[PDB]
Design a protein around this ligand. Structure first.
Ligand SMILES: [Mg+2]
Ligand SMILES: [Mg+2]
Ligand SMILES: [Mg+2]
Ligand SMILES: [Mg+2]
Ligand SMILES: [Mg+2]
Ligand SMILES: [Mg+2]
Ligand SMILES: [Mg+2]
Ligand SMILES: [Mg+2]
Ligand SMILES: [Mg+2]
Lengths: 292, 75, 159, 170, 213
RNA sequence: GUCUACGGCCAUACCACCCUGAACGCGCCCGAUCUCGUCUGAUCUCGGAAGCUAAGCAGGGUCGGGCCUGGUUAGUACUUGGAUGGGAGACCGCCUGGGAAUACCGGGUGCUGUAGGCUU
RNA sequence: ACAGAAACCUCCCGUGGAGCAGAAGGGCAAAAGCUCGCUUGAUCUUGAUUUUCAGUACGAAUACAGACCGUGAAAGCGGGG
RNA sequence: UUUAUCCGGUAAAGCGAAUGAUUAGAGGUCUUGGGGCCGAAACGAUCUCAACCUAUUCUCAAACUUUAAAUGGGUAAGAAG
RNA sequence: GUUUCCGUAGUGUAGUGGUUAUCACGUUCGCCUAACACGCGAAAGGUCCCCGGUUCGAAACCGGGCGGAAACACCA
């Protein structure tokens, strides 16, 4: 034996964590740092751009923090990109662009600002930083929220930020970790961001893993062979989304009312139904062993 | 030559003989102590109230004659 | 003689209550204060920057200043007689909104309402509060029982 | 039938404890280097002990963690020196197991009169798909109640892949 | 040796328990808080005789010493060496002090009088409240008179006053004695050597499955 | 009915074990070309979509431990004022008011906020 | 494997029972703890306030504002500990 | 003084809640031991005493605390709204 | 009672700053001697008083205690 660590006294003195840290989701320190507004403002919100590349889809959404629970002004997912001609690879760094580009444009058509501060248009992968216009409404500002992503160079979280910055949002961003930063000379290639933004890191993988062997092709990406996507075409997939997204960003959420409303959860058992289960046992125990 | 070392014995009597006074507070207390970036701004707000007095005066007669009309329409 | 130290005897005061040692809940620094608002100081151990001093712990005062994460606040502090209205700088973690004010402003919003109405009638309504009156002669009814007879019970040494 | 309860090797650990801090340790670093194919980490002392000749923050051992395919290829060519037989108390309460060897040349290793004969410590962390839940960063978790590898489940693992004769008696 | 118990009779100063803050305490005089057949069962000793204090006072360690011994001696006697169990329920816990005897040689030349009046530990003492038990004995229901007289002799080693009282509990438990047999069969109570374990309708059902099996 | 993203109050939410999860998602999972990081693609970063609810998670279950609330303990312990009350003293009683804590019995076991799904 | 109550490795449990230069006391867990990389906010400058209090100093501290910066994707944090 | 409303760690209480003391038995080769007695020896048998711990039980804390009073300290009860 | 000082091999004593422990004698074994001395060669021996803390590590640095010692207890 040993001493029982988890005593009765262990649980009497045990104080649980904040729930959202039980699930391991929320850095509230670095949420306290990120969210609370200075009290020289007292009401004006502090917007954050949230990016959580999930496992299969990249969620983008802008939120300010209220005391009831932060409200979401605009959300744009990666599973809506097929509407704009992107069928596959929508957890990849190229698609985090279009997600963040969508998010930026779907936000800027409300508050009537889609006709100003379009940011970089073609694409470069360089230092762009929207400069608010005099005599016009000031540019929209928010601060990137990485959540729990170890933000080394190339990571898509602040790679989706490049989408919002290209969309017209004035987010303070450096380029020290955009894919392309040379961590041994401290500068930019800026044509590496060219490729990674349009999917040539996936094209050149799609071209090394074709000539070397088959059946590694079609196992590494079947749905890129299916749906008739190819190299020499990917660059002209996202270059259409980058244009199709920016001509109509508005969401038109699908109408929903059919459900018959059955309950295939399992309900909570009432008091007296537990209260007899004992006395429904202990009559099955007594009767049984008062024989043999 | 030892002596008493302290006491608060009849002190309550003394400082309640003239009846402890809650500090007399006026309206318009001093702005000394407020952060400079407030004042350094609110002084510019106060310094240029007059530039824009024409709007204020005519717009006052507008509501003064619209509520001289509102009290006369009741009559 | 005792030591003048700023945090003497606070061993038991600034101590986080129980099963709460940890992250400050984020609501406490996302409610807003504006000058005029009444506030009750209540220190707290976890945050040491911008703490009040133990003689204000438990006291209320109105707000006169608002910096980025602190609030200038005027309280009264009694010293050997003369009460000095003195202003201290306290970071927000040691501050609440005192609902002491908020019973009124709800008697006010209701008084102003009950006066605007019943003015088209002219019937004078009891606007003032009024202390708990005499309890207003009534009846008691036993139905079909006499009261239960109570008797002081015989002592016996329990131990 | 079990969909994915494939009891498989998560890692294979090697350790050469030589409380000497210099040569007899710098040479033992090539043993794991040659045997595995990856530069081994230098461990150091937790604190000083007199009777042993070791000092705090002084280097003592050199260790290695080999996983993947090359971990089956050294677990195999591991046992077969113990000739596919172990002892009851090598399979721990947590579903791991370990066996020491006494000389590193019997693992197909060329002996030098300078590079001596330092045996090593083989330890094997058995796993199962879904065990990295503990180690990840976002949304960690505990590995169920079953899905944990018991002492008896790890026993007949080794009796059914390398056909050991696990022998009773301490 | 020691001042008469007079001077340390009243509970004047806050408890001074032996801790890191007072050290060098002379070990308490009384050591053994229960004697007789402490290897008895509950089912064979139904008489909870008590000696209850009636005044809020202190009891010297050396008093609890003689009060125990003189009760062991009118017991094993009429009762026999097996037929009782004696409990002392006051552990001398609060440390009593002595300014250092104002020691002087010859007539004197100096003592300093009161400078550093704070004194050394001298012994230990029990704190007793009104209606709190000092000693308790348990025997057979047969042997009542000999519990009364054995506790009546121990009163004479104690200051103040204390009543002798025979409890309505069974032996040393907390359970009213008219109810024991009823709460033993049907197992609301389970023998546990000296004491007894009250098993409620709370725990897991298998914990029952052991009993009534 | 329920989930996902970001949350508020932070156990009625925890812990231990037991059972069941349609579809969307969440996940496990499959690789190391590029980005990035390691003694180790184990974690982190990245490219994925062959499998499975085995687990996390969700949902329940336990005369379960814990917590949350009531009852009792108890008008008991204690106490604001009061007496030319009692007592050698320790202390105790009464008058005027306020009024606890265990053991021991019950009941409950996460509420919701915004934005999006799925059950069309 | 040599290896023993103690070296090294691995898994499991671990609300803090460790650690935080020092006395204690508070406070602290994807921290304020430990390990790394980059550094000089331990810098220049007015006032306001707190603490002892006469509501004088000194010491120490708390919020700001103005410069120059450090750091980090950034929100921020930092004018000794 | 009411009516709202915050503040509090003293009396009491508790220690089958932490920390610190501490009695007893039942339970445990937990661990292990040091003596034994029956054993060459044997977790073999029976003891024993030590230390731990599984349900218990006796008694405590000014420099301990889950709880937690009474008296008491703030504000607020409008025209400066 | 207050203020100092020490404790190290069988014995008296060195010693360091925190990595090591001496000297002399005693003792054990040889050698010379007819035999002892003397002399020559080798040897073995201490928790560095008992403690807890600090520290990587204490015999040595702190705190308490135990034992042996020294110095004050004046004006009436
Ligand atoms: Mg961070
Ligand atoms: Mg005098
Ligand atoms: Mg992998
Ligand atoms: Mg599952
Ligand atoms: Mg399942
Ligand atoms: Mg329960
Ligand atoms: Mg500055
Ligand atoms: Mg620091
Ligand atoms: Mg106090």
């Amino acid at each position: 034996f040993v001493k029982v660590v988890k005593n009765k006294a262990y649980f009497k003195r045990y104080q649980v964590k904040f729930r959202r840290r039980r699930e391991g989701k929320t850095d509230y320190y670095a949420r306290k740092r990120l969210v609370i507004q200075d009290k020289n403002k007292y009401n004006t919100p502090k917007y954050r751009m949230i990016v959580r590349v999930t496992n299969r889809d990249i969620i983008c959404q802008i939120a300010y923090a209220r005391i009831e629970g932060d409200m979401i002004v605009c959300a744009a997912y990666a599973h809506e990109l097929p509407k704009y001609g992107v069928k596959v690879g929508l957890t990849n760094y190229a698609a985090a662009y279009c997600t963040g580009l969508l998010l930026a444009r779907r936000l800027l058509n409300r508050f009537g600002m889609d006709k100003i501060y379009e940011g970089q248009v073609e694409v470069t992968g360089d230092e762009y930083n929207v400069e608010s216009i005099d005599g016009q409404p000031g540019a929209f500002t928010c601060y990137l929220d990485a959540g729990l992503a170890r933000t080394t160079t190339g990571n898509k979280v602040f790679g989706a930020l490049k989408g919002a910055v290209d969309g017209g949002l004035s987010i303070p961003h450096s380029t020290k970790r955009f894919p392309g930063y040379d961590s041994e000379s401290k500068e930019f290639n800026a044509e590496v961001h060219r490729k990674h933004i349009l999917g040539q890191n996936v094209a050149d993988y799609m071209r090394y893993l074709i000539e070397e062997d088959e059946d590694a092709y079609k196992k590494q990406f079947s749905q890129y062979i299916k749906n008739n996507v190819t190299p020499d075409m990917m660059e002209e997939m996202y270059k259409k989304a980058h244009a199709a997204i920016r001509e109509n960003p508005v969401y038109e959420k699908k109408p929903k009312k059919e459900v018959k409303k059955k309950r295939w959860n399992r309900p909570k058992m009432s008091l007296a139904q537990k209260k007899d289960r004992v006395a429904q046992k202990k009559a099955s125990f007594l009767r049984a062993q008062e024989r043999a | 030559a030892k002596s008493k070392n302290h006491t608060t014995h009849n002190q309550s009597r003394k400082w309640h003989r003239n009846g402890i006074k809650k500090p007399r507070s006026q309206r318009y207390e001093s702005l000394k102590g407020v952060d400079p970036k407030f004042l350094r701004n609110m002084r510019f707000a106060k310094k240029h109230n007059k530039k824009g007095l024409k709007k204020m005066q005519a717009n006052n007669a507008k509501a003064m004659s619209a509520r001289a009309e509102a009290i006369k329409a009741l009559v | 003689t005792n030591t003048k130290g700023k945090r003497r005897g606070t061993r038991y005061m600034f101590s986080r209550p129980f099963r709460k040692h940890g992250v400050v809940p984020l609501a406490t620094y996302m409610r807003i204060y504006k000058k005029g608002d009444i506030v009750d100081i209540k220190g707290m151990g976890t945050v040491q920057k911008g703490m009040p001093h133990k003689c204000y712990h438990g006291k209320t005062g109105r707000v006169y200043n608002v910096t980025q994460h602190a609030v200038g606040i005027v309280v009264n502090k009694q010293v050997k007689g003369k009460i000095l209205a003195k202003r201290i700088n306290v970071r927000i973690e040691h501050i609440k909104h005192s609902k002491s004010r908020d019973s009124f402003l709800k008697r006010v919003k209701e008084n102003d309402q009950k006066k605007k109405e019943a003015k088209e009638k002219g019937t004078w309504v009891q606007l003032k509060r009024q202390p708990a009156p005499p309890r207003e002669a009534h009846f008691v009814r036993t139905n079909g029982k006499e009261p239960e007879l109570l008797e002081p019970i015989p002592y016996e040494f329990m131990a | 039938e079990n969909p994915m309860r494939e009891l498989r090797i998560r890692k294979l650990c090697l350790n050469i404890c030589v409380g000497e801090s210099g040569d007899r340790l710098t040479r033992a670093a090539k043993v794991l280097e040659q045997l595995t194919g990856q530069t081994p980490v230098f461990s150091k002392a937790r604190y000083t002990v007199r009777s042993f000749g070791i000092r705090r923050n002084e280097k003592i051992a050199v260790h290695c963690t080999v996983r993947g395919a090359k971990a089956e290829e050294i677990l195999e060519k591991g046992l077969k020196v113990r000739e596919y037989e172990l002892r009851k108390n090598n399979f721990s309460d947590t579903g791991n197991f370990g066996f020491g060897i006494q000389e590193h040349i019997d693992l197909g290793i060329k002996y030098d009169p300078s590079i001596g004969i330092y045996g090593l410590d083989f330890y094997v962390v058995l796993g199962r798909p879904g065990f990295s839940i503990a180690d990840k960063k976002r949304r960690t978790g505990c590995i169920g109640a079953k899905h944990r590898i018991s002492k008896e489940e790890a026993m007949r693992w080794f009796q059914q892949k390398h056909d050991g004769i696990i022998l009773p008696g301490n | 040796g020691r001042r008469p118990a007079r001077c340390y009779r009243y509970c004047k100063n806050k408890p001074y328990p032996k801790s890191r803050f007072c050290r060098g305490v002379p070990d308490a005089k009384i050591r053994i808080f229960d004697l007789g057949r402490k290897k008895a069962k509950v089912d064979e000793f139904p008489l909870g005789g008590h000696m209850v204090s009636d005044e809020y006072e202190q009891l010297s360690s050396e008093a609890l010493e003689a009060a125990r011994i003189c009760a062991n001696k009118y017991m094993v006697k009429s009762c026999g060496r097996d037929g009782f169990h004696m409990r002392v329920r006051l552990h001398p816990f609060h440390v009593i002090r002595i300014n250092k005897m104002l020691s002087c040689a010859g007539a004197d030349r100096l003592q300093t009088g009161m400078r550093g009046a704070f004194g050394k530990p001298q012994g230990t003492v029990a704190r007793v409240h009104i209606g709190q038990v000092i000693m308790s004995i348990r025997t057979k229901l047969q042997n009542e008179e000999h519990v009364i007289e054995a506790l009546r002799r121990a009163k004479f080693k104690f200051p103040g006053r204390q009543k002798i009282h025979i409890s309505k509990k069974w032996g040393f438990t907390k359970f009213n004695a008219d109810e024991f047999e009823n709460m033993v069969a049907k197992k609301c109570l389970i023998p546990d050597g000296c004491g007894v374990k009250y098993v409620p309708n709370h725990g897991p059902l298998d914990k029952w499955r052991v009993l009534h099996s």
